[PDB]
């Protein structure tokens, strides 16, 4: 009863689904594009729009309302902005996994180095847990050091 009335129904969290954020989703949920390195417009209040302190991102001042939701400081949750990168860069938390995925697939045709014809590969695919499945597939496909343009008939590889 300490929160102002909102017509949306009140429910409780039953599931938390994790995952990564696609660039399309990052662009969609954003409200402004950040491009100007200068934090302050002219050091005369009113921080520069399109900068790191854009008023659309949210308000942290008592007398200033958010320009996106219009709520006060006590109610505005903050809104995200997005920054376009000139060249793609690695995510520091996924470099070992990126290396493993590069070891598991071919760098030209973009296909797995092993197929379901191998009984061990089919057995590995049969498992359910994604992490253990990836571990088994990597343990198998690590040894396979050459892409096959023909079936070990063409398997879709480039050789």
């Amino acid at each position: 009863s300490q929160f102002p009335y909102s017509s949306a129904p009140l429910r409780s969290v039953k599931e938390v689904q994790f995952g990564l954020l696609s660039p399309e989703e990052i662009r969609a949920i954003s409200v402004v594009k950040i491009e100007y390195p200068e934090i302050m417009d002219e050091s005369r209040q009113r921080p520069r729009e399109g900068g790191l302190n854009d008023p659309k991102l949210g308000s942290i001042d008592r007398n200033f309302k958010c320009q996106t939701c219009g709520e006060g400081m006590a109610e505005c949750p903050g809104h995200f902005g997005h920054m376009e990168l000139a060249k793609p860069v690695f995510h520091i938390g996924f470099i070992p996994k990126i290396k493993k995925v590069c070891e598991c697939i071919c760098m030209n045709c973009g296909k797995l180095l092993l197929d379901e014809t191998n009984p061990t590969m089919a057995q590995a695919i049969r498992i359910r847990d994604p992490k253990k499945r990836f571990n088994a597939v990597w343990q198998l496909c690590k040894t396979k050091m050459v892409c096959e343009a023909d079936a070990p008939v063409s398997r879709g590889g480039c050789g």
Partner: protein, 93 residues
């Protein structure tokens, strides 16, 4: 009200007291989540009575939650690192 006190309250079995200590007597907060994307990206304007999730382009399937402000901060910091924690109010199996 550290972790050991939380464990003692669990041992007593008092779930209501624990919830009240960690929410009402502390950082309680209200957020809106889209019923589709599951993210806290709803642009809610309470005075005008209009809610809208731009990514999913919906105005109806929107719910509100009561979560600790630290949880909201944690989810936003996770989103800052390209991780998307999606909160859903129904199970799927």
């Amino acid at each position: 009200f550290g972790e050991m006190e939380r464990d003692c309250m669990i041992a007593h079995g008092a779930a209501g007291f624990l919830k009240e200590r960690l929410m009402e007597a502390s950082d309680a907060f209200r957020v809106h989540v889209c019923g589709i994307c599951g993210l806290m990206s709803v642009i809610a304007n309470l005075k005008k009575n209009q809610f809208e999730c731009r990514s999913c382009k919906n105005k109806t399937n929107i719910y509100q939650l009561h979560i600790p402000y630290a949880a909201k901060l944690l989810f936003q910091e996770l989103m800052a690192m390209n991780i998307a924690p999606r909160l859903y109010t129904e199970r799927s199996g």
